[PDB]
Amino acid sequence: AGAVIDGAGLGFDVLKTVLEALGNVKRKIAVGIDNESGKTWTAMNTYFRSGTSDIVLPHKVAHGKALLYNGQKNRGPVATGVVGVIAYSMSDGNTLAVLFSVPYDYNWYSNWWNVRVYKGQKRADQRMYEELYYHRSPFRGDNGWHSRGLGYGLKSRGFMNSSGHAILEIHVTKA
């Protein structure tokens, strides 16, 4: 599962459509990551701190392609939201990691996201979640764009909306 498209085509409308495919689950997320890194990406794993997906990370995401992925709250009366880390291996032997955090209760919490390059093949897990959420200055899902250099000749530019029906759009480009 998990579709790929031309990166040039990635945008808010495309991700809204992804979002809408999932239906009115109370908390969910549509994730688009645009690979303009100059390298081929290959899926490693997704670490869900909470929530799940019915789909699989697109296995291969070439330079020039964006991946569309999604996540949703666990079924039933569960209020831990959809919080996770996506990990792709890049053809230079390093890892691109993406954090998403979509809480249940917006009267307490907010959406957050982050992006980071790790040296080597590093699977998403709890230590990476904690680093990206608590240590590495994540960006608020505040309906605004945020840019930052990643090192390693790359940078990120991304956008996350503010709500429980979440949209996360990230572009990883050469710096």
Author numbering: 5 to 179
The authors write:
Fragaceatoxin C (FraC)11 is a potent haemolysin of the family of actinoporins, defined as a group of ~20 kDa protein toxins produced by sea anemones. Actinoporins are classified as α-helical PFT (α-PFT) because the transmembrane pore is predicted to form an α-helical barrel. The lytic activity of actinoporins on biological membranes is enhanced by the lipid sphingomyelin (SM) and by lipid-phase coexistence. Here we reveal structures of FraC corresponding to four different stages of its activation route, namely the water-soluble form, the lipid-bound form, an assembly intermediate and the transmembrane pore.
In the monomeric form of FraC, the side chain of Phe16 is inserted in a hydrophobic cavity of the β-core region.
